[PDB]
A paper describes a structure:
SulE, an esterase, which detoxifies a variety of sulfonylurea herbicides through de-esterification, provides an attractive approach to remove environmental sulfonylurea herbicides and develop herbicide-tolerant crops. SulE catalyzes the de-esterification of a variety of sulfonylurea herbicides, such as MM, BM, SM, TM, TrM, EM, and CE, to the corresponding herbicidal-inactive parent acid. The structures show that SulE is a dimer with a lid loop in a domain-swapped β-hairpin covering the active site from the opposing monomer. SulE shows a similar catalytic triad consisting of Ser209, His333, and Glu232 at its active site.
To elucidate the catalytic mechanism of SulE, we solved the crystal structures of wild-type SulE in complex with CA, mutant S209A in complex with MM, and mutant S209A/H333A in complex with MM, SM, TM, TrM, EM, BM, and CE in the range of 1.29–1.63 Å. By contrast, the sulfonylurea bridge and the heterocyclic ring of MM was clearly observed and well localized to the active site of S209A/H333A, indicating that MM binds more stably in S209A/H333A than in S209A. Upon binding to SulE, the seven substrates adopted a similar conformation with a bend at the sulfonyl group, making the aromatic ring and heterocycle nearly perpendicular to each other. The side chain of residues Ala234, Phe257, Phe293, Trp296, Trp297 from subunit A and Ile43 from subunit B forms a deep hydrophobic pocket. The aromatic ring is trapped in the pocket and packed by Arg150 and Ala234 from both sides. However, the heterocycle moiety is located outside the pocket and only interacts with residues Ile43 and Phe257. The hydrophilic sulfonyl group is close to the hydrophilic area of the pocket and forms hydrogen bonds with one or both Arg150 and Tyr45. In the six structures of S209A/H333A bound to MM, EM, TrM, CE, SM, and BM, the ester O atom is hydrogen-bonded with the main chain nitrogen atoms of Gly78 and Ala210, forming an oxyanion hole. Superimposition of S209A/H333A-MM and P44R/S209A/H333A-MM complex structures revealed an outward movement of the lid loop from the active pocket.
Author numbering:
A (entry chain B), B (entry chain A): 12 to 360
Write the structure that this text describes.
């Protein structure tokens, strides 16, 4: 199970832009402490890793981590089992894993001065946000409250420290620039499949509307819904009568219709409630967010699309968290992804 | 040259601690926007990647990136040629690559509030520092001034953007906590060899004094010298008669002596002046820094050690930058590393 044979592997940077400080750089002056004077800074670039099997079959897969994560989540599970990178190289796909701008080996744009500030220009905000262990516990549906596990959980229990250590903050890089970096990657690699997760769900949908090389999307637990501009359906508030899900992203209809041209599958784990759950904010949030996604997929299908929602429990898999690709049954989750790729010929040359 | 057969690969997090916000966490209350209330945050953990060959020989190698870098520099060169990770898995060594705390997939400790601040506790500074392209150009001795190459350069010209894109800031995590994470990794791995670079040179020396499992060190272009406490020799200022090199790190003699028990090699590239060069601050800085390191190695040898300085031009390799392991002749640089490992019995089981 662990052996893997690579025809080649590597990593590279792509995308981003440059910003400049004032003045001129004098090489005879002390270079350290570092100065903005005469400075050119590369910002908002993305890190990309690839592993290619011998004699690949079908399209390369681009695995895109969720919010506050990195490509680590596709490399290994918290308890050290093979991640989807290894499983799909073994399945004879070339596999790209990214650290998007602002995360991991992607660029964090900061300079000499308060965080994110280049002289008088605010590239990203100095004030950050970041989930706690407790927030992530309920966000990812390990259980209804920190320390608790749902019955039949597939979380790798005992490896909580490993799991939460993989998570961190994201600077306020614009989503436009994150999407731009991945569009450039898709141009670089050719026809490919995007496999997204939570926060990258809506970003991957956006990439597909700008990049015809995206030939399919599988989105694990996408966090933000997407609709044609002015056609967002009625979406109820949460059971606490006061909160709402994330404002759906709206794109022009001519771009939205590009989503009807490729196979798209949204995948959800277990323990999303059917009924309002006022006592558990993030469980109720997932209920209404999944509902909004069902309407988004229906809108894609009314325009001639091939969009579907897979609830893992209906496929016979019980207990998955919001990271099904690192849960204890991730091999079975991978099998369902192989099934999708095979159904649409994305595993053939 | 590109193929690699892995018995296993993966990644994991190790080291770090936790800090806590005030108050308690209520799962019924809105979890987003994220709050410090009731929060546990994992901070200062390190990312570790490993690739293991079939039938490994000798000790595992731990590759430790320089300042503002990540394990990318061991994966691939800026122009896409195999890095030392691939070369030494092919040489039948298990290879670990790290993103140290505060870099890449390592943790950047920030919360909900101004960067690095947890309520009124400053975990890392809000004001950052970061090299420009211009500062890094002369730091790494691509040439004497930005945009200019030494005639003999081994840099992969044309891939400047790719190269500079791999560099970024480091938050003010204490060096103690960075050393702590790698000591914990070395305890987990068992006997190994540290391969360090620039800023991680002094940190690897410190790790060796705390971890008998470190059985050898090869340091490329180390940036800070180390001496026994109270025994720093006379080191001249730079040619501008105002600047100094980095204040040498001082450790108790009992720990310093541990450096005499293992083979240690410092490796320097080309274009470091023999004579004072006041027009080019970083060239002169490298002259005096290399001199300080020569005295450091001499001090280890006077304690019965086996500490050597390898200037790559004396081995027939001309024009290397301060990243010899990603230069155009990196295969030849690797050969010299294999020779060190072999001579010292580190390539046998
Ligand atoms: C892995 O888990 C998630 O990925 C994840 C999963 C579920 C919800 C949220 C996230 S997230 O933390 O990244 N945030 C996100 O998708 N975007 C977003 N949108 C708005 C409008 N506000 C905020 O506030 C943070 N975030
Ligand atoms: C994921 O499920 C829970 O999280 C969960 C849910 C409810 C209770 C307990 C757990 S548990 O997992 O902590 N522990 C558990 O189940 N213990 C247990 N021990 C014995 C000795 N026998 C039996 O059952 C016969 N159960
Ligand atoms: C890849 O290049 C290097 O590794 C590298 C190479 C040569 C010099 C500097 C660096 S560095 O930028 O990271 N900084 C470093 O080693 N430590 C350090 N120590 C002091 C006392 N001040 C500062 O200020 C920056 N830094």
């Amino acid at each position: 199970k662990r052996k893997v044979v690579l025809a080649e592997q590597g990593s590279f940077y792509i995308g981003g832009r440059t910003v400049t400080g004032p003045g001129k750089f004098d090489p005879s002056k002390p270079v350290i402490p570092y100065s903005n004077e005469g400075a050119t800074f590369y910002i908002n670039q993305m890190y990309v890793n690839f592993q290619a099997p011998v004699r690949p079959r079908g399209l390369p897969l681009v695995f895109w981590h969720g919010g506050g994560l990195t490509g680590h989540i596709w490399e290994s599970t918290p308890d050290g089992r093979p991640g989807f990178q290894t499983l799909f190289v073994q399945d004879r796909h070339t596999v790209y894993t990214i650290d998007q701008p602002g995360r991991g080996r992607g660029n964090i744009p900061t300079f000499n001065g308060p965080f994110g500030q280049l002289e008088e220009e605010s590239i990203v905000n100095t004030v950050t946000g970041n989930s706690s262990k407790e927030g992530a516990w309920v966000r990812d549906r390990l259980g209804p409250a920190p320390g608790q596990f749902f019955e039949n959980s597939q979380f790798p229990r005992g490896y909580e420290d490993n799991y939460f250590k993989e998570m961190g903050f994201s600077p306020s890089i614009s989503s436009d620039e994150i999407v731009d970096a991945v569009v450039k990657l898709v141009t670089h690699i050719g026809p490919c499949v995007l496999v997204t997760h939570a926060a990258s769900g809506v970003l991957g949908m956006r990439v597909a509307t700008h990049a015809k090389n995206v030939r399919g999307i599988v989105a694990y637990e996408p966090a933000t819904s997407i609709f044609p501009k002015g056609k967002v359906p009625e979406i109820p508030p949460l059971a606490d009568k006061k909160s709402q899900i994330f404002p759906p992203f709206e794109i022009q209809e001519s771009y939205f219709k590009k989503l009807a041209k490729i196979p798209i599958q949204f995948v959800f784990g277990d323990n999303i409630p059917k009924n309002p759950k006022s006592a558990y904010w993030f469980l109720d949030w997932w209920r209404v967010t999944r509902y909004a996604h069902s309407l988004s997929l229906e809108a894609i299908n009314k325009l001639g699309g091939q969009a579907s929602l897979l609830d893992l429990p209906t496929a016979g898999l019980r207990g998955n968290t919001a990271f099904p690709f690192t849960d204890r049954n991730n091999v079975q989750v991978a099998s369902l992804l192989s099934d999708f790729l095979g159904k649409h010929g994305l595993d053939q040359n």
